Design a protein around this ligand. Structure first.
Ligand SMILES: OC[C@H]1O[C@](CO)(O[C@H]2O[C@H](CO)[C@@H](O)[C@H](O)[C@H]2O)[C@@H](O)[C@@H]1O
Ligand SMILES: [Cu+]
Length: 581
DNA sequence: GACCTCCCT
DNA sequence: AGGGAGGTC
């Protein structure tokens, strides 16, 4: 395997600053925030170059070239490079092609997470997987200069070679604008969000942690008093023995490994013995303690008291974002004791406030749009309570005859319809029988014949084309749709049904983010985007901007696309994330 | 290092 | 429907 030719440069030259280049700014640490850049490579019309970061990033011409938006770069995962460079006070501009995002749009099922995996999609194999170069786990390391340098230049050369074929394919798929006008500009916005971060009131979490520690100690002792002995409550072997052998509790669910102690199961066992509610309480508290007190405190930067998440923009199969380290998309809200964690998330400057705007029922509104179901579209045109309306229809009752249990069940059905669910899975959910579940679904489709039609038509389209699409032309390939195995085919069908709804919702909120960022700038507001949680945007702004944000944010979000039904956005603000309710 | 419950939308 | 994050072996 003969080396690829390149200049191991000792200094930056003019021919390295062409107005078109593939660029590699390598950040090997997974978490790129304030992380080292271990090397640089540039491939352009004049050749291939490796530069050492301490050289290139001290060179004013290079830094200016980095920041010049008329000097176009092709990269893989530009957000990583962008953020790492922001921490060093350097702006990266002019990124006109991101191979990671191109690969993700073409097929999110491939799990492209390095240049080698993207290149393999076009039968290009003259580059190694990062894992082969860096190793894995405790053996992970930056290799010596000649090996590192060759690797970065090969990645750059791959990018240079693969841009045209990736773009041609995106174009054939009508995904070219989706890359260039949505995902790439979103990438910059997300880079700013991650860099800005979110301020944490660590003292507040620590005293929450102190309280929890005390309450956990109390319940733990109670559990041991009720069990008549001590044991590792978090050990599935030990607990299963206490519950199902020593205390003779019925076994309602098994798990391949052993006895199920899932919360759905424990709830049914609670009548039999007082230990059960205490174990549940213990789990709720321990979850908060371990994950959202301890876990959060571990990743707060002590110098700024901020958490800086990383939004994985090229992971989920539907076009949603994900968030890591910490995950700021699963902060408790459902139960009050856990929701109080949100009080620890505070504005980053004094006299600023948190502002949260969320779409109201975006998935069902999208479904109404794509199905063209007359009844559902009317329901949203009237701005009805959708679950109450759905109860009225499937039970054939007047609004005044809808009971709370009726509403709750219509709500579960609505979620089921959205997730493409079937008699069995709705059964599990409503704690009812398969045949009953099947009658609900049948009643649903009688009231919403357009949605039935859609569910039928989309599964057939998935079979005929091999994939389904979203509003903005995101794509998901569903080859299991023709499996002769019921369970595998059926999962594929649900995906066929759900992906255009979940994915189109993701598309809309991504566009809103772009539109919003543009409006914020035009208006010269200091308001800034901090977070996205699938159907909601969280910002922080001076107290003096709230009144304008109240009008501006919902409007931008509501007007992002025009559907057959209105989009509706609710909003709140307050001293903390908790209070923005 | 791999494999196997509970938090969010 | 999508995700992220301690015991056992
Ligand atoms: O797609 C964004 C993200 O994906 C990569 C690989 O493409 O994944 C690494 O980085 C993320 C962010 O910390 C980690 O969660 C993941 O485990 C890593 O493999 C990375 O390059 C991008 O930043
Ligand atoms: Cu786990």
């Amino acid at each position: 395997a003969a080396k690829m030719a390149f200049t191991l440069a000792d200094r930056v030259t003019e021919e390295m600053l062409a107005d078109k280049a593939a660029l590699v700014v390598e950040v090997v640490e997974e978490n790129y925030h304030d992380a080292p850049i271990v090397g640089i490579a540039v491939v352009n019309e004049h050749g291939r170059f490796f530069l050492r970061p301490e050289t290139a990033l001290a060179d004013p011409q290079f830094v200016a070239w980095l920041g010049d938006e008329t000097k176009k770069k092709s990269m893989f995962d530009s957000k990583r490079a962008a953020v790492a460079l922001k921490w060093k006070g350097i702006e990266l501009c002019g990124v006109s092609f991101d191979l990671l995002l191109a690969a993700y749009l073409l097929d999110p099922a491939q799990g492209v997470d390095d240049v080698a995996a993207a290149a393999k999609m076009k039968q290009y194999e003259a580059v190694r997987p990062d894992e082969a170069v860096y190793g894995k786990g405790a053996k992970r390391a930056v290799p010596d200069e000649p090996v590192l340098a060759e690797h970065l230049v090969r990645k750059a050369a791959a990018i240079w070679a693969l841009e045209r074929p990736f773009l041609d394919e995106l174009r054939r798929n009508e995904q070219d604008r989706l890359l260039v006008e949505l995902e790439q500009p979103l990438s910059s916005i997300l880079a700013e969000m991650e860099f800005a971060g979110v301020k944490v009131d660590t003292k507040r979490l620590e005293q929450m942690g102190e309280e929890l520690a005390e309450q956990l100690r109390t319940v733990e002792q109670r559990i041991y008093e009720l069990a008549g002995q001590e044991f590792n409550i978090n050990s599935p072997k030990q607990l299963g023995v206490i519950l199902f052998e020593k205390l003779q509790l019925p076994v309602l669910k098994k798990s391949k490994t052993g006895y199920s102690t899932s919360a759905d199961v424990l709830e049914k066992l609670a009548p039999y013995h007082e230990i059960v509610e205490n174990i549940l309480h213990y789990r709720q508290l321990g979850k908060l303690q371990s994950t959202y007190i301890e876990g959060l405190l571990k990743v707060v930067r002590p110098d700024t008291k901020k958490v800086h998440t990383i939004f994985n923009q090229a992971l989920t199969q539907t076009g949603r974002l994900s968030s890591t380290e910490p995950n700021l998309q699963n902060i408790p809200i459902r139960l009050e004791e856990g929701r109080k964690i949100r009080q620890a998330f505070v504005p980053s400057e004094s006299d600023w406030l948190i502002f949260a705007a969320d779409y109201s029922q975006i998935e069902l509104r999208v479904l109404a749009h794509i199905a063209e179901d007359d009844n559902l579209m009317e329901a949203f045109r009237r701005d009805l309570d959708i679950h109450t309306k759905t109860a009225m229809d499937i039970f054939q009752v007047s609004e005044d005859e809808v009971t709370p249990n009726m509403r709750r069940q219509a709500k579960a059905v609505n979620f089921g319809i959205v997730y493409g669910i079937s008699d069995y899975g709705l059964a599990q959910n409503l704690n009812i029988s398969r045949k009953e579940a099947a009658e609900f679904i049948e009643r649903y489709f009688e009231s919403f014949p357009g949605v039935k039609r859609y569910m039928e038509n989309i599964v057939q389209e998935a079979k005929q084309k091999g994939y389904v699409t979203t509003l903005l032309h995101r794509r998901r390939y569903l080859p299991d749709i023709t499996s002769r195995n019921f369970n595998v085919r059926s999962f594929a069908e649900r995906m066929a049904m759900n992906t255009p709804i979940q994915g189109s919702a993701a598309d809309i909120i991504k566009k809103a983010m772009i539109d919003l960022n543009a409006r914020l700038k035009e208006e010269r507001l200091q308001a800034r985007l901090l977070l996205q949680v699938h159907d909601e945007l969280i910002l922080e702004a001076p107290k003096e901007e709230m009144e304008r944000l109240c009008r501006l944010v919902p409007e931008v979000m509501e007007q992002a696309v025009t559907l057959r039904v209105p989009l509706k956005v609710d909003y709140h603000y307050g001293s903390t994330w908790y209070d923005a309710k």
